[PDB]
Design a protein around this ligand. Sequence first.
Ligand SMILES: Nc1ccn([C@@H]2O[C@H](COP(=O)(O)CP(=O)(O)OP(=O)(O)O)[C@@H](O)[C@H]2O)c(=O)n1
Ligand SMILES: [Mg+2]
Ligand SMILES: [Mg+2]
Ligand SMILES: [Zn+2]
Lengths: 104, 170, 111, 1112, 14, 221, 105
Amino acid sequence: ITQGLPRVIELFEARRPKAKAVISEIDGVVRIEETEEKLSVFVESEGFSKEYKLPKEARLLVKDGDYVEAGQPLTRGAIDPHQLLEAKGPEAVERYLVEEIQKV
Amino acid sequence: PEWMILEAVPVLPPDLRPMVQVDGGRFATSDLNDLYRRLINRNNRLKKLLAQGAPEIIIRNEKRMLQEAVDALLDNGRRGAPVTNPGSDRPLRSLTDILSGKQGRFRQNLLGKRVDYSGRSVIVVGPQLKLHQCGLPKRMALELFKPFLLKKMEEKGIAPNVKAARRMLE
Amino acid sequence: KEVRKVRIALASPEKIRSWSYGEVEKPETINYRTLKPERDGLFDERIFGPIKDYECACGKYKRQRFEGKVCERCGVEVTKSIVRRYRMGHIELATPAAHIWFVKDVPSKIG
Amino acid sequence: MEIKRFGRIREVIPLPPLTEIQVESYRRALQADVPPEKRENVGIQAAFRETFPIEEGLVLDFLEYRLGEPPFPQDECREKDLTYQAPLYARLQLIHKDTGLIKEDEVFLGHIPLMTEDGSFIINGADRVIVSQIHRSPGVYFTPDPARPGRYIASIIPLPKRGPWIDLEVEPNGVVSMKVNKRKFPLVLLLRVLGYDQETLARELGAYGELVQGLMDESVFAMRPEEALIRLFTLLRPGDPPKRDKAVAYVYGLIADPRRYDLGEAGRYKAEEKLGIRLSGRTLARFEDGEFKDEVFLPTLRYLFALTAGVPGHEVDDIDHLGNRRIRTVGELMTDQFRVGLARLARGVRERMLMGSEDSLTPAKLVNSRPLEAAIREFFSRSQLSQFKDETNPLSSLRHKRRISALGPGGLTRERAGFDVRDVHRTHYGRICPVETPEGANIGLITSLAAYARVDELGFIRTPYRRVVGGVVTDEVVYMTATEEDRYTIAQANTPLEGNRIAAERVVARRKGEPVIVSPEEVEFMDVSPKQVFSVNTNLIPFLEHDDANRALMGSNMQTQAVPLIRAQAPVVMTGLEERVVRDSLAALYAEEDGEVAKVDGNRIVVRYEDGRLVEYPLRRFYRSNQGTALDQRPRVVVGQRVRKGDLLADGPASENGFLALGQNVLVAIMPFDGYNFEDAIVISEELLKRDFYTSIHIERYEIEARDTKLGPERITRDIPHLSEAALRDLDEEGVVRIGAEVKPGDILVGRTSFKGESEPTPEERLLRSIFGEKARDVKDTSLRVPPGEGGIVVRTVRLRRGDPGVELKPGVREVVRVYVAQKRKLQVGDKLANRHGNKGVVAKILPVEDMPHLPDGTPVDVILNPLGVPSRMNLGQILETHLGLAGYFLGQRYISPIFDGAKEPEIKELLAQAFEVYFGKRKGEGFGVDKREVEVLRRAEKLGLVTPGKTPEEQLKELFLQGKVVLYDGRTGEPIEGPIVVGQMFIMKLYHMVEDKMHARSTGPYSLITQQPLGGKAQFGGQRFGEMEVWALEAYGAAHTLQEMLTLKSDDIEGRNAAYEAIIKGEDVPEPSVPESFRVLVKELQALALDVQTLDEKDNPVDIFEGLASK
Amino acid sequence: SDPVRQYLHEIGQV
Amino acid sequence: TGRGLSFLDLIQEGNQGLIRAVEKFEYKRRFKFSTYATWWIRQAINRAIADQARTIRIPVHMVETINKLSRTARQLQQELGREPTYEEIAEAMGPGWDAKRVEETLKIAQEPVSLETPIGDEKDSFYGDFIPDEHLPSPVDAATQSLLSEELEKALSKLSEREAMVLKLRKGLIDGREHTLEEVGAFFGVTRERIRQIENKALRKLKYHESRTRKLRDFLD
Amino acid sequence: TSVYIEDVLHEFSTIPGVKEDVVEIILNLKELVVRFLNPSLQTVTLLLKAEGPKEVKARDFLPVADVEIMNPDLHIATLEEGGRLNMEVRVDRGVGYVPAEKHGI
DNA sequence: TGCATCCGTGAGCCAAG
DNA sequence: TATAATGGGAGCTGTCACGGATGCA
Ligand SMILES: Nc1ccn([C@@H]2O[C@H](COP(=O)(O)CP(=O)(O)OP(=O)(O)O)[C@@H](O)[C@H]2O)c(=O)n1
Ligand SMILES: [Mg+2]
Ligand SMILES: [Mg+2]
Ligand SMILES: [Zn+2]
């Protein structure tokens, strides 16, 4: 099972992918809070707390209470290169784009 | 800024929009001429409608039609309906069209061209060649290198002069 | 003099007229009998130039002896016919008209 | 030979007449054998009835039309570059309303083209074929709304050009919207204009959950119908005066006008079945007794609401079901253009009716035919669907006629061609062939009519099934649409039958495509034949079941491209189709009744029938097809022969005794050969050329005109200035070449002089003339010579002059001369060969016979195909075709192996055993033992596990022969090929892609007007294209100088190219390029756009690239 | 938008 | 509509006719204005259609003749069940009309065709991308004019500089034009008979060289 | 190596009264085996005249001394009532396979 | 500040036609 | 040059994805 050519074009064109991965704007620590009917992930810093509301069935890659770098992925999925840029800087996007293109 | 408004509308040199007789003695001609002819008729009728002091409704209509003539000449299709030549669905080919696209001036004649001293034929394995060779049909070669052959034909005895050697391969 | 850059700028009415070799006053192309260019029309040799190398329209001047000369009987310069690819005409409008590139290319530069 | 034939399925019905889709449809549209008053309101009759009567005072009505006889027969039109056609007259009468004066007249409308017996046309002299269009059937559909899962879109769709698309959506705001001419408005309004009333709509639509409330708008029922109609008119024509008569006119034309809106008879029936209602006409509503009465809008609305609630018995529609896609055959396509031309004629009628003497007006004085003559001429000459006929060989013509395009006027644009369109929808079964289609952009958009398939009255494609009742397979054959087909369990044609009963506890069937194992109790129908699933071409492929679909596609299409060979052979392994195809394609001639054959000639066959009469069938001999292949018939009976009705009298092109002969049966070995068959290249034996296999006859046409010029006349003359009698040897007194002569490139075919123009002599001319004392003649050599790399034997000249009788040329033309030149084409290095399983390759090397691998009895193989072509391609059919062909080489028989009902391996091995005995017991008797080399090869075979250890030489050789393999000697050396090799008979064709047509080279030549760049293509002696990507190649190599040549000296730098040519002919290295002309063109075209482009030097100071010539 | 509807309107004024 | 002018162009030419009618109307005849206006409005529309509809402009009387020819041919086809020959059209045209005249009138009425006329049913071809430019000299032609000039000078050098210069003056290799014998004779300070005689001997010697070397023959054709 | 038929101009022809076309006739004549008894002989020109209902075989050639037709049974043409054939077929000595496009005899 | 919607622009090369 | 004549017709339709400007709550 592959993504192929379009994934390459999704990258060289720097397009925000449809099934995008939510990434942390900052550093922090994970607090899961899942109602039977709604779900959200909070990334809490030493005095800064960011909330990330996402649909119930989306996969995570964070076991609760882990330490994550700004721009790490919390959802499975493809990272928006622009969010990665704003969060983590040009070297990070360069790594990301090169590695994804080569994956294809 | 005002230069984005036109007073003198330039006209392209005629050879770049010719009126040619073809083999049969019939005439072919490029769409720009009908675009300019639209333009010039509407402009002239406007100069006359002004001289004869016509009402506002009429002068206004003429002015609108004049703008649209300029629009079709420059980028036909851009605003409104595209101008078609009578009894056809084909849009007329405007200067913007000449410029832009896979078929336009840049891509079609400027970033790539047809070329002289060139040929084409079917290929065939030929496993005897060495890596640096290819087999080339004689007749192909004779035409591909024709001027060199006129020269060398003259250097040896095979013809008196270039013009004779060229007559000799016709 | 070797070419090193290529500039592209807007064209003033005075520059368009400076390019021009004559207003094209009539919508005519070539005469239905002579098959020669009509005067003051889209192919007039008086504006855009001689059709045959060094030969004016009417006939009075037909050799390179006279170069640059403008014929008195027909108005056609005696130069290389090649210039019919290079000599701009012009048209003078009764009302000025918008250049649609600067109107419908959004965001409109005029607007 | 004996023709052993395999197969168990017996075929209840024969293949229907194969060009019926064309011949029938045209008949039906013309109704020309029908007496006028007996005609139906279809085809061009329907067009007439639609246009007429024409009113306004004066009325012009239409009684009837008639089609006279062709002014010239088909052959004559083909020669005289005419159109085979019929005169069209229409009896029309003028009536003045008041006066009652009725003056009547049969007025002539010009000519309509006639379809020939075989289903093609002749337009300005060339055979053309009108391809059937596939499109979405008119009707009412429900497709899901792609944004809003639980919402759906009703689409009401008319015929092309006979109405607007209408959509009915349930908005997120609750109100039901109708989209028409791209405007969304509340459907409520139109419902009101129909006479509807919240009473009636409440009782009809109340059931459905809360939906009906979104239809309740009190502000609408407030108005009488006229007020609602005017509200709608303002909503659809903003600003236009909402005058009462004008709004009734517009809305009527939008929704009820039978001369403006039109579903099909198909659109009608489909809506009837879908919404469970009955229509009156072919529109959406009517005007009765002064008001508007609904027909379709409320039924569609009810179905929409029920689909949205969830009511059982309502579903969306698979718009790619071949029940929702229909065919527009030739008659429908031509009629539509008829309808159009008639409308224009009607505008001209009303025009001349307004002004001019309103007492002295006859039908003749009111009817300009030219609108209609023009519309028809257009549709036949420049339509997208009017293709140049492909008559490469008979089969190519037939296949063309059975094509289906999704493209064309009123069809898909290549941009609008998604996946689902191109998919092999399940309902293509038995209707459209899943194999024959092009590889490329057009994949799945151009398809072929399946073999047993037929197009019904409504335009849908039907396929036949046997009826099965209580496990008996009747002979009652039902043709079904796919909507029909979806109702049944349908067993597979191969299910086993004792007698007429299903002898299998479990049987293989389809329900709605889905494959299913069922009991004969459940079986309602059964397939007619495997043949029923594929196109004719695909059906011509033996062992198709052993070939992957991708290469079967290539075998299918490539048959289209077979050149008729002077010694064509039917394949040693046929499918059974090969005879019917020659028949339906009108390849051959057949006996019309029982008879005795009177005379037999190169040119004619005369037959004396049972009525004592004499028929003289003349033979088309060496005629030039559209593609220049030779269409030529040969007599296949002799004086005295008794012949039954339908016995072969003359083989066509590519026919051998009435069998399709697209190629030759050659002896192949499947082995590598010193790279000469690398990557699909093919080796052949010189024997093939010696015995004239793969030799074909081609004719080119050469035309010339001498016309009247301002400067004097062109004339066809032998008296051509400055030529030697050397140049003129083969020219008759009038300047035309002599029948018989051999003509080579450079040779004159037709002389001609043209007058020189204002040739004011350059001083060098004056002095040179003086030195030589010869006046430069009035005229100059403009004769028609032979183009490079063309040539042959002149075989006819046609000459037409002005003043000759029957002859009138285009104005100014004095004379036309045609010269036909024929050539016998042997096979040559770089010509293309293919087989019927997609094996294709160019001929790369022709060894002399002594190098060819041979069998031990001294017999050379004809062709050596590389095995590496097989595994990747997965077309094992050719392999089996070879094994069988091995046996028929020694038994001396051909074969018929139906697809999916063919010779199985053990039967082929039976045959191979019989063959082996013929091939080896011969040698035993003639007194020779097993050769030493054969012992060595046997040893190698033993290590390969191909023979059993211990058996005898004869036992082991037979063991190999049974696997298709034979000991093979390398004729170069006499040593044996280290292993045994697959050798046998294969049917191989010479496709139309011969290198003689393709090789081309240009030193310098014609350039183009505006670009001053070289023209393109062989015919124009043009230059190759060095495009953007070639430029990239040169850029990435860093060959700046090579690159720069391509951009300047080698095209469109005028100074540079002239200078380069002179340097090369003088041995001087080539000058530096200057500015390419097309850049000067760009500068000027930008100036023409009021943009100043300005070349600059480093000091930012202008550089003039027009060398002064453009500044004052 | 449609330069003929425009003129039919302006005509509809006088 | 249809006749070669846009609806709007028709309207504007009709308005020109409206202006004419207004300035020429006489209310005392008691006619409504519409009756007089329609004459001039028709006249103006028709003069426009005649004067403008052709890329190759045709005088209005000739257009009238061409339309008469069109309609006569249509009548003839409507009664002949086929198209008329040049002879049938000339007959129905009256006297003064023969077949050659009908044919010349047809030839003159031929309207040109678009260089951008589509070839094929893709978007990547233009009629007249197949029209070769006949005007600009070919590179062979040009090379051949250079080789001529050079070999003519080669031959002229084998004359005395006066005979060479006299021939160059006389044929136009110097200043474009041909000179008279009286001019060359006044320039070299001899009698016009004398310059005619040295020209004759220059040509005699050039003919002799061209006998003995054959270096100019091939250029002549 | 070369054939003249009277009233025939080129290879792509028919002859009235003859079932076969010139192409088939030359295809037949290709086969024809001609033995030269005298060793110094390079070329012969067989003459043939024939007519009337008759299956002209190779026997029907005019005999020439020091020349023997080894396959006289070889069929050549089928002629029906009033069909006339008159050929001059030239047979050369030579080696290898030399195609018509290369000797033009 | 956030969305939905709308208009314009682009969608492989060569070959023959 | 004079009866009177007073507001048009053809739309044409199986894409699709993006970017960037307008349009709303
Ligand atoms: N429309 C087109 C048609 C052809 N081409 C070019 O021609 C080749 C056809 O390959 P192919 O599939 O016909 C055979 P090959 O590549 O050797 O693999 P196989 O033999 O194992 O099947 C392509 O690979 C392209 O280079 C193109 O660019 N666009
Ligand atoms: Mg034959
Ligand atoms: Mg007469
Ligand atoms: Zn002059």
